[PDB]
Design a protein around this motif. Sequence first.
Motif, PDB file in Angstrom:
ATOM      1  N   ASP A 226       0.875  -1.167   0.000  1.00  0.00           N
ATOM      2  CA  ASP A 226       0.000   0.000   0.000  1.00  0.00           C
ATOM      3  C   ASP A 226       0.907   1.210   0.000  1.00  0.00           C
ATOM      4  O   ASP A 226       1.165   1.827   1.057  1.00  0.00           O
ATOM      5  N   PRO A 228       0.780   4.250  -2.288  1.00  0.00           N
ATOM      6  CA  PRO A 228       0.283   5.166  -3.312  1.00  0.00           C
ATOM      7  C   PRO A 228       1.350   6.191  -3.674  1.00  0.00           C
ATOM      8  O   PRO A 228       2.086   6.717  -2.815  1.00  0.00           O
ATOM      9  N   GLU A 242      -6.546  -4.815   0.806  1.00  0.00           N
ATOM     10  CA  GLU A 242      -6.312  -4.862   2.237  1.00  0.00           C
ATOM     11  C   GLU A 242      -6.723  -6.213   2.845  1.00  0.00           C
ATOM     12  O   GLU A 242      -6.022  -6.773   3.672  1.00  0.00           O
TER      13      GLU A 242
END
Length: 581
Positions: A226, A228, A242
Amino acid sequence: GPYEATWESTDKHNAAPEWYRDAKFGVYWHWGAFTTAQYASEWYPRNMYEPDSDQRKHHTETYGPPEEWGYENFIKGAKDKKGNFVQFKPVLKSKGGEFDPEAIIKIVKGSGARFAGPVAEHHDGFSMWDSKVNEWNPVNYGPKLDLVKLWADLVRENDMKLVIAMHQAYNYNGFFQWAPKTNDTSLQKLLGQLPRDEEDQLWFDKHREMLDHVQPDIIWNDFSLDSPGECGSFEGPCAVDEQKRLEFLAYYFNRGEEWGKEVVTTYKHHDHGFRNTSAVDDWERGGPSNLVRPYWQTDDAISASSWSYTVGIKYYSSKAMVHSLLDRVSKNGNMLLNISPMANGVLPEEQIKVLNDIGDFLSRYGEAVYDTRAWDIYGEGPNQVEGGSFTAPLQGNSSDIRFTRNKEDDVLYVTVLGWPEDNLVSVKNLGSNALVDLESLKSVELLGDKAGDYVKVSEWEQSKDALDITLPSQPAESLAYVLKLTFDGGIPVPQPERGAAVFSKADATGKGVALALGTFDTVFLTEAGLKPEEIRSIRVSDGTKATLFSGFRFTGESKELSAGEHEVEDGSVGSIVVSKI
Ligand SMILES: *[C@@H]1O[C@H](CO)[C@@H](O[C@@H]2O[C@H](CO)[C@@H](O[C@@H]3O[C@H](CO)[C@@H](O)[C@H](O[C@H]4O[C@H](CO)[C@@H](O)[C@H](O)[C@@H]4O[C@H]4O[C@H](CO)[C@@H](O)[C@H](O)[C@@H]4O[C@H]4O[C@H](CO)[C@@H](O)[C@H](O)[C@@H]4O)[C@@H]3O)[C@H](O)[C@H]2NC(C)=O)[C@H](O)[C@H]1NC(C)=O
Ligand SMILES: *[C@@H]1O[C@H](CO)[C@@H](O[C@@H]2O[C@H](CO)[C@@H](O[C@@H]3O[C@H](CO)[C@@H](O)[C@H](O[C@H]4O[C@H](CO)[C@@H](O)[C@H](O)[C@@H]4O[C@H]4O[C@H](CO)[C@@H](O)[C@H](O)[C@@H]4O[C@H]4O[C@H](CO)[C@@H](O)[C@H](O)[C@@H]4O)[C@@H]3O)[C@H](O)[C@H]2NC(C)=O)[C@H](O)[C@H]1NC(C)=O
Ligand SMILES: *[C@@H]1O[C@H](CO)[C@@H](O)[C@H](O)[C@H]1NC(C)=O
Ligand SMILES: *[C@@H]1O[C@H](CO)[C@@H](O)[C@H](O)[C@H]1NC(C)=O
Ligand code: NA
């Protein structure tokens, strides 16, 4: 098992077990179909398709336009433009080839590694175990070998813990963004072009299959869990679903319970995909400038330019690798070093020499490294790493010290990164400006030519600036030298020049922890040896202030304290910020 796929459940996993904190040094290797071209880096499968790239140019000149001679040809085999058959196809030495995994694992054991293992799958879609969930593997294609099982079995034969590195998230988060679209569903799986829900499931399924196959002690993960913003121009979340991340954590931690093993998983320290409650933060090609808690690790490479072998590749010096190991270990981390076998499975002799040199250091001086813990101050001197990922390895000299201590907390190891021509080692954090009482310093010894041999150091004086230690006769040459300081009843708590020190008794005595400038939460203080609710006094250095917070992590009621000694109400502190004025 007892773990569920929730943050709250998986948080309860012990992130860094004692064997792992004891281990300090490990070795892994980026070797796979991405090595076949031996060009640019392990990102070659990605960049061979990139518009106007050098890798695309090379690919086009050597093999063919990537639109015709795609990455999959390295796995399945194809002729290059000069008619040579090209394929990732290592052949065992026992079969007349050049691939000798047993010899490589003996070299790795000789380097002093206490954990070791392969990259099992990089970003390129190629699982290197016998995989049912992914047909792109070296049992179906190429060498017809389960490379990951071969490595794993050899690592266990040679009494090292097994690390497996997995990088299969970026596969479908942009790595292959420049590859042609394909409707071949098998090829879609290699190139990360399946529907995203299928890719998220495949991420988990790959982990599950691999970890049941070889029962790794550590599962190392790359970014795009995760993260970004870290996947370049590709339009996507740069993340794994997730729920699938949580299913992985629960599945692995449950298997650890079933196996009766304390397992570890790591992830990149800027990535948000896991939590530092149950996973260990990994700093890539660098590490912190400061002592960081909780326990963390560095993964670095033997070459600056690539993780995978390329023609013309250059390597770091042994000195840089040993000094960098000492730096990380002094700052409360481990260091995992990547090595780079050629496509045919041969480990270049320059790399063997580095590993041999690291092993000579650790077999002689392992007492100061293995089974030690960071002190409260990591080190001293002019040569320092910049801090952060993607920073230069440390190379120090006789001006530089790195500290470690024993578990009993009554032996301080002072490792000097060169031989002092003036025969003097000055330890500033043990001088009288540091408010250190040396009445309990029972002995000072220089570690000798082999482990367990010591040379007595008879001459030392404590000045304002430093504990000034006169060295005995120089022992056999080494990349660093180690002084062993043994104390009656525990190592003194130093006062940093700028910083603070906190204590369990109301009068700046008792159990203590020295603090540099920085921010120190409940986890930090607890791991350092003093739960913040047990703090009863603080000594703030000149030129410094400390702000006490009631909260776990710099929230709640706060109080500012200037230079001097202050009593602290029991159970009032949760975290502390130490600042220069
Ligand atoms: C101007 O300045 C302001 C102020 O600094 C900037 O504002 C900040 O902007 C941030 C980015 O938008 C914002 O963070 C977001 O906050 C929300 C609400 O707290 C949070 O949900 C976001 O987290 C999601 O998205 C990030 C990517 O940004 C993922 O890394 C993260 O894992 C989360 O993903 C989940 O939600 C997404 C939908 O938003 C799903 O697409 C994704 O799949 C994932 O869903 C799963 O997880 C969920 C739980 O996380 C779960 O419910 C679900 O079922 C799935 O399992 C992100 O952190 C800051 O809050 C905001 N700050 C302030 C003060 O406003 C602004 O960006 C600046 N402007 C510019 C142009 O730069
Ligand atoms: C493990 O993972 C967890 C979970 O992801 C990580 O936890 C996160 O840790 C963050 C860093 O501590 C924390 O953010 C902090 O949250 C507090 C509370 O909201 C916030 O006040 C902090 O903001 C201050 O600090 C940042 C730098 O971190 C500054 O950029 C910012 O401007 C604020 O600065 C002020 O306070 C600092 C003290 O923290 C001072 O150093 C600074 O000079 C400045 O001081 C002024 O304000 C003070 C009052 O606040 C005052 O005393 C002073 O005199 C000045 O007036 C920061 O955003 C996250 O909340 C936290 N997340 C969670 C979910 O817990 C954890 O770090 C990870 N562990 C490791 C080892 O990486
Ligand atoms: C791939 O399949 C899609 C969907 O049927 C089709 O529109 C497209 O033309 C196909 N690609 C090629 C190169 O034929
Ligand atoms: C060690 O490095 C420091 C910082 O570069 C330098 O000042 C010092 O002279 C060096 N020592 C020797 C013996 O070269
Ligand atoms: Na935990």
